[PDB]
Amino acid sequence: MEAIPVKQFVKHIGELYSNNQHGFSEDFEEVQRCTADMNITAEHSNHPENKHKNRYINILAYDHSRVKLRPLPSKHSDYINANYVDGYNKAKAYIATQGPLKSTFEDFWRMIWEQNTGIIVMITNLVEKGRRKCDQYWPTENSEEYGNIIVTLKSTKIHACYTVRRFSIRNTKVKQNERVVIQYHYTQWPDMGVPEYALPVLTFVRRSSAARMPETGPVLVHCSAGVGRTGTYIVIDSMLQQIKDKSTVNVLGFLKHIRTQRNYLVQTEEQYIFIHDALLEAILGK
């Protein structure tokens, strides 16, 4: 399970695709099994006091990597369904989290302030195929207040496949009290499966990743559950970094690693293949 030289990676992808994607299936089954001999606790996710804070009953936040909110003058006011996840050669490069619920909007933005997050990556529409995937946690226009955080929409650019919203947020309890937060929102996403072409997503990953500023908190990445598309983004971004640093790729090894940090990151075999397509586009595009 060593790294694959980048110059051999597209050849590797041909082999994985062959025979009705046998190789991809083997890789992904190995991913799903790599948890087998591991008990990873999620006690806080399962506490009765926190259950209404989880969008999905089966999508939990592992204790050891969970993001903790500073306590409030409830013993469980520290909980949010979110985990630190490593990036390439960097611990806790991301926070992967669910699309926030109306009831967790205050927690959501409090986390963003406390963690010094400056980039939000949103990889879902609020509604897909007539189904609620995420609640709108930002102001349609001007300002909105979420607890002690006031969020102000400054500018929006709407590209073909994604939208960039520039916010300024303020903490009303701080007297240094304002920060820029940029949201990268991928908008062109099929209700079922993954986008037919990887290039639009590659472009989105490159630009949202390049927006990361030295030196700030982890980039917040969410979709609906915050595992499938979220894991897909994290692997693509991280492997682009590895390619740039060492001209090698290790999709399988890196994914088995982050799977210990949030459950189900990269949730389907189709997303696993899509990661490869995106990296293929990057390699061939050069």
Strand order of the largest sheet: 2-3-4-12-5-11-10-9-8
**Distance N to C terminus:** 26 Å
Q: Total number of β-strand segments?
A: 13
> What would you report as the Rg, rounded to the nearest angstrom?
19 Å
Defining key terms:
monomer; 286 residues; alpha+beta; Protein-Tyrosine Phosphatase, Chain A; nine-stranded mixed β-sheet; two-stranded antiparallel sheet; 7 helices; 33% helix; globular; Receptor-type tyrosine-protein phosphatase gamma
Notes on the protein architecture:
This protein has a 9-stranded mixed β-sheet, with helices on both faces. The protein has one domain: Protein-Tyrosine Phosphatase, Chain A (Alpha-Beta Complex). The protein is globular and about 55 Å long. With 286 residues, the protein is α+β, with helices and mostly antiparallel strands. The chain has helices spanning 9-33, 43-46, 105-114, 199-210, 228-246, 251-258, 269-285, and strands at residues 4-5, 66-68, 79-87, 90-97, 119-122, 127-128, 131-132, 143-146, 149-158, 162-171, 178-186, 219-222, 248-249. The chain is built from 7 helices and 13 strands. It is classed as hydrolase/hydrolase inhibitor. The entry lists the keywords tyrosine receptor phosphatase, twisted mixed beta-sheets flanked by {alpha}-helices, HYDROLASE-HYDROLASE INHIBITOR complex. The assembly is monomeric. The entry is titled "Human receptor protein tyrosine phosphatase gamma, domain 1, in complex with 3-[(3-bromo-4-chlorobenzyl)sulfanyl]thiophene-2-carboxylic acid".
Write the layout of secondary structure elements.
Layout: E1 4-5, H1 9-33, H2 43-46, E2 66-68, E3 79-87, E4 90-97, H3 105-114, E5 119-122, E6 127-128, E7 131-132, E8 143-146, E9 149-158, E10 162-171, E11 178-186, H4 199-210, E12 219-222, H5 228-246, E13 248-249, H6 251-258, H7 269-285
